[PDB]
Design a protein around this ligand. Structure first.
Ligand SMILES: *[C@@H](C)[C@H]1/C(=C/c2[nH]c(/C=C3N=C(/C=C4\NC(=O)C(CC)=C4C)C(C)=C\3CCC(=O)O)c(CCC(=O)O)c2C)NC(=O)[C@@H]1C
Ligand SMILES: *[C@@H](C)[C@H]1/C(=C/c2[nH]c(/C=C3N=C(/C=C4\NC(=O)C(CC)=C4C)C(C)=C\3CCC(=O)O)c(CCC(=O)O)c2C)NC(=O)[C@@H]1C
Ligand SMILES: *[C@@H](C)[C@H]1/C(=C/c2[nH]c(/C=C3N=C(/C=C4\NC(=O)C(CC)=C4C)C(C)=C\3CCC(=O)O)c(CCC(=O)O)c2C)NC(=O)[C@@H]1C
Ligand SMILES: *[C@H](C)[C@H]1/C(=C/c2[nH]c(/C=C3N=C(/C=C4\NC(=O)C(CC)=C4C)C(C)=C\3CCC(=O)O)c(CCC(=O)O)c2C)NC(=O)[C@@H]1C
Ligand SMILES: *[C@H](C)[C@H]1/C(=C/c2[nH]c(/C=C3N=C(/C=C4\NC(=O)C(CC)=C4C)C(C)=C\3CCC(=O)O)c(CCC(=O)O)c2C)NC(=O)[C@@H]1C
Ligand SMILES: *[C@H](C)[C@H]1/C(=C/c2[nH]c(/C=C3N=C(/C=C4\NC(=O)C(CC)=C4C)C(C)=C\3CCC(=O)O)c(CCC(=O)O)c2C)NC(=O)[C@@H]1C
Ligand SMILES: *[C@H](C)[C@H]1/C(=C/c2[nH]c(/C=C3N=C(/C=C4\NC(=O)C(CC)=C4C)C(C)=C\3CCC(=O)O)c(CCC(=O)O)c2C)NC(=O)[C@@H]1C
Ligand SMILES: *[C@H](C)[C@H]1/C(=C/c2[nH]c(/C=C3N=C(/C=C4\NC(=O)C(CC)=C4C)C(C)=C\3CCC(=O)O)c(CCC(=O)O)c2C)NC(=O)[C@@H]1C
Ligand SMILES: *[C@H](C)[C@H]1/C(=C/c2[nH]c(/C=C3N=C(/C=C4\NC(=O)C(CC)=C4C)C(C)=C\3CCC(=O)O)c(CCC(=O)O)c2C)NC(=O)[C@@H]1C
Lengths: 162, 172, 172, 162, 172, 162
């Protein structure tokens, strides 16, 4: 799974050599940045429910036809509304994992891979999820580098959907 | 592969959960202990050649049947292969130290190694001895109080010893 | 691979015989029934996406443990792989329909599939359910009396059902 | 084995796609042509013995040295004459299989593959078999498209020997 | 691979010894008998096509079930494969004759051959008969007193027979 | 293992063909040269101890620091002196094997492969072994073609160390 540490090891291993200072500095960078990353991760987790609830409504507001149109791929029924909230929660959870791991690995493996195939097969619009991610970014309440950290992974998800 | 952080993430995902206050604290501690981990990797790596050579010399002095004509380490090609294996094992052990998890060591090195030695006719019990020798030398170097900010690295040394013993058990 | 015609030829060659008056009549009948066979393939193929999606949705509604975090169809990568398998199986079944023989399905798809799922940890019993769902939908579409010259396709539908059940048994 | 149907499936399978109208039209072409092909197949089968007997004599007449020269690879002995008739029967049988399958597959698999190696190893002249095939073509008694069908596979065999 | 000389060297190295007066004498004798060995290889090789064809014809005359429709040597492709195998076996046997050791024959030809025939359904007992036929013809040609300086090649013929029987046993 | 015979067989086998006169002449060349090769092999073996003892002293004389410098990779201790004599004996033994096999195969397999890795790892100087080989060449007492044979393999070892 892609993290600064596994990436350092992968590089040395492909070259069949021991880790060098080149790789150790990378890991130190990761250890130092962890402070900001963890602050972001804890905040998003602590406030997960309100962010998810708010994000879902932000989508329904931007795309009203998602609350009334007939079809299982819309939120027009209790079940659809549950699937939607679940999905948004998956994105938020992935963002916190990336912050914890210090890399995109978790989101790359559990969510982005196959993402296009899923949205196409189940008739889910990427635009819906981008709106939810924009809501989380605008309202996570973080500042400074913790914000930079959170936004980097939120924007990473947005780009994966674009 | 996985490092200590990815490992916790993988466990949480399988359960579909965000991390708990405790899990966050655990990972944060690992970070706070990062410096020591980096020193152990640098120190062991910086003395990799002597750790392997010294352990190899000791092994052959103890077990001369290995280098006697007919022995598995007789001929330059087998001796070179033997030396290479020692270096390879030490290399992967250091990767595990940096990652804080034995996954890379198990997946890329130890898995199927016993079966490899059996097919070749290499005595795994002897390889285990070589590993143990590098272990004692690696820890003595990593935990040398000279030329470094004073502190307790006992937990880390126990972790490092664990990886070496793990490799030794995988062949023995 | 073999189609219904090559199959009869292979059997005759193993015996070193020319075809008998009966064998010729049998193959000629298959030809006379060709139109129906082409309609079934076109109809199923033309609705392949909905047949797979509808069957997949039904499967997960019935078996929610499959998509629950930790389940074999959890994560986009596994869900995609699962959807792909459904499509692959449907694809090969249609090939068997066109050929009038299950050889291509057995050789290129079903052989070793159970062992593949066991190694991966995929529940074959659940795949069987997915196959059965596509079977019922595929036959309903192929045998729809609307928009087609009226006639009896019961034998063909029985043949088609056979291929689906064959695939279901190969994993279950 | 090469038939219009297995060839249609092979194409779609190599491209990892479902059969399309492109392939279905090919199979229809095969189903329509079957009428002529089967007519040819039934006739050659019904008249197999006379065609084989006549073809063998046609070879002996064109190449008289095949009935008197000493050696197991000639027809100068009961055994040789039996091997010859057997071989010609193999060719005729293969031709009927091709007509039944609607393709060269049967002849390609059971006869043409290794054909050169066999004739070279056992000192059999390709010219002998070409003469037999020419006899069958001239005397099968077919007309119209049934003749076109029979001759296409007979000439295919002749070219494989040339 | 190894030839008669490399074989003695490998044995001495495993013991870490120089060659003994006897070993030197043995190898020197092999050299003195070199001419005969070269004649056997040239003679057999120069008649390879007839040795295989004659043996093949005899085999099929004795065992007509092999060429009957359905038989393992029926169809040109199988007959060609069968002829090829005969030629391959004869080829490797001649290599063993030149080398004065069966290593190349065992390693590159005979090893896994029985398992190959079993998987294919080829009757190894019949292949053994084919090998025995080539053996008798090869020796008759190699030991033909005509057109060659008179001498005793009985030991060599016994050695050659050994390789053929070795190949026959590996499939039978 | 590389000998004129295995090399002849390897060539024919890679081409999937029977041995030809091209290869048989090579083996004859080997059989004829064996006379000289064996003469060299027997002599070096018969005189092995004096050659080894003399060669070791030649090294100590050229490189005196090898008898007094502290370290297990020198001959400054009974053990080091035993390892040195052993090594020189290995080289001489390999030379006799090459002469017996009529090729470099034995030395290539048991000694040259991995040679660089060994000397680098154990801090052994190639120059030490070259001096020992030069001593053996200068004092083996052979003349004529037996000398040419012995020297070809001794120089082969020297080049492998250069
Ligand atoms: C046990 C292994 C021994 C030990 C370790 C120890 N080290 C430190 C502190 C530091 N180590 C480093 C080293 C690096 N930082 C990097 O980014 C890299 C990669 C290029 C390396 C190699 C640094 C910068 C520090 C902090 C500054 C300093 O020198 O103190 C400590 C202090 C822990 C605390 O640093 O945080 C300790 C205890 N000490 C021992 O006695 C063992 C022999
Ligand atoms: C059962 C599967 C259903 C059914 C089938 C049925 N179809 C026909 C006849 C025809 N079908 C075709 C279709 C094609 N011909 C082609 O070459 C191709 C590939 C491009 C296709 C798709 C054609 C041309 C015919 C004949 C003309 C016509 O439209 O009738 C029949 C009649 C059998 C007889 O055609 O020969 C039948 C019974 N009928 C049903 O009620 C089922 C739902
Ligand atoms: C048994 C196999 C038969 C037999 C053999 C026999 N041959 C020789 C002698 C020679 N053979 C050769 C042949 C070659 N020399 C080569 O370099 C090559 C490769 C191009 C070949 C093929 C030669 C040159 C000789 C020596 C000269 C000669 O013709 O005599 C002997 C004599 C042994 C002694 O040569 O040394 C014998 C006994 N003799 C038989 O009766 C068997 C049928
Ligand atoms: C919410 C923004 C909108 C919405 C959502 C909705 N989603 C689905 C169904 C699925 N969603 C996923 C997504 C994931 N699965 C994963 O494993 C991961 C990574 C951990 C993700 C992101 C999948 C796979 C499905 C289909 C399978 C399933 O049911 O789980 C639905 C249901 C669709 C249906 O037809 O049954 C809905 C309604 N819909 C909206 O209108 C919102 C605006
Ligand atoms: C040394 C302490 C002992 C010893 C070792 C020895 N090993 C081999 C051969 C092999 N070792 C491996 C192991 C690995 N290859 C890998 O890529 C990895 C992960 C990066 C591992 C762990 C393999 C694959 C081989 C065989 C392939 C090869 O040799 O290149 C030998 C060689 C045996 C032979 O050539 O016959 C030896 C001698 N031998 C001892 O006596 C010591 C106890
Ligand atoms: C869906 C209904 C169920 C399900 C499926 C699932 N399958 C896999 C993985 C693989 N499936 C195959 C099968 C084939 N590959 C082929 O090429 C062909 C013939 C054309 C077949 C039949 C293979 C080879 C794999 C593994 C390789 C790969 O995934 O690319 C998975 C993935 C498991 C994993 O990644 O660990 C899944 C989830 N899973 C379910 O729960 C349903 C019951
Ligand atoms: C007839 C036109 C002339 C003739 C024929 C003749 N043929 C053989 C021997 C063989 N013929 C074949 C041919 C086939 N085997 C196959 O499996 C197939 C495809 C189904 C074919 C076409 C083969 C393999 C043989 C050799 C093995 C065997 O005996 O079956 C012989 C005998 C040769 C011998 O030396 O024993 C003869 C005489 N000969 C003529 O003169 C005719 C003009
Ligand atoms: C002939 C006397 C008998 C016979 C033979 C037969 N063999 C095969 C197929 C194969 N034989 C081999 C063997 C080798 N391949 C090698 O490269 C080497 C070393 C150089 C050996 C020894 C292999 C690999 C095959 C299979 C691959 C292939 O055929 O290309 C067949 C074919 C069977 C089939 O196609 O189904 C046959 C018929 N058969 C007999 O009846 C005789 C007793
Ligand atoms: C002698 C010229 C000088 C000398 C030699 C010396 N050598 C070693 C150690 C080793 N030598 C070898 C060499 C080989 N091993 C082989 O299998 C083969 C091919 C058959 C060869 C040529 C090896 C592998 C070793 C190391 C392992 C072992 O001990 O066997 C030493 C000991 C070094 C040590 O540190 O223990 C010495 C002293 N040293 C001199 O000063 C001489 C001038």
């Amino acid at each position: 799974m892609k993290t600064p540490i596994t990436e350092a090891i992968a590089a040395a291993d492909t070259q069949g050599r021991f880790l060098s200072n080149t790789e150790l500095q990378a890991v130190d960078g990761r250890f130092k940045r962890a402070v900001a990353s963890m602050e972001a991760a804890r905040a998003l987790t602590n406030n997960a429910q309100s962010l998810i609830d708010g994000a879902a409504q932000a989508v329904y507001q931007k795309f009203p036809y998602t609350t009334t149109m007939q079809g299982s791929q819309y939120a027009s029924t209790p079940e659809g509304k549950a699937k939607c909230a679940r999905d948004i929660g998956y994105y938020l959870r992935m963002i916190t994992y990336c912050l914890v791991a210090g890399g995109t690995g978790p989101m790359d493996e559990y969510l982005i891979a196959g993402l296009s195939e899923i949205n196409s097969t189940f008739d889910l619009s990427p635009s819906w999820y981008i709106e939810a991610l924009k809501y989380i970014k605008a309202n996570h309440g973080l500042t400074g580098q913790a914000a930079v950290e959170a936004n980097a992974y939120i924007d990473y998800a947005i780009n994966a959907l674009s | 592969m996985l490092d200590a952080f990815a490992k916790v993430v993988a466990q949480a995902d399988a359960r579909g959960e965000f991390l708990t206050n405790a899990q966050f604290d655990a990972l944060s501690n690992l970070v706070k202990e990062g410096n020591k981990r980096l020193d152990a990797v640098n120190r062991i790596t910086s003395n990799a050649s002597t750790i392997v050579a010294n352990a190899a010399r000791a092994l052959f002095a103890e077990q001369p049947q290995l280098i006697q004509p007919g022995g598995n380490a007789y001929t330059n090609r087998r001796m070179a292969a033997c030396l290479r294996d020692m270096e390879i094992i030490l290399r992967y052990v250091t990767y595990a130290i940096l990652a804080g998890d034995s996954s890379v060591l198990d997946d890329r090195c130890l898995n199927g190694l016993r079966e490899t030695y059996q097919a070749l006719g290499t005595p795994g019990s002897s390889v285990a001895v070589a590993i143990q020798k590098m272990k004692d030398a690696a820890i003595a170097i990593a935990n040398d109080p000279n030329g470094i900010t004073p502190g307790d690295c006992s937990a880390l040394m126990s972790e490092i010893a664990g990886y070496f013993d793990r490799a030794a058990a995988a062949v023995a």
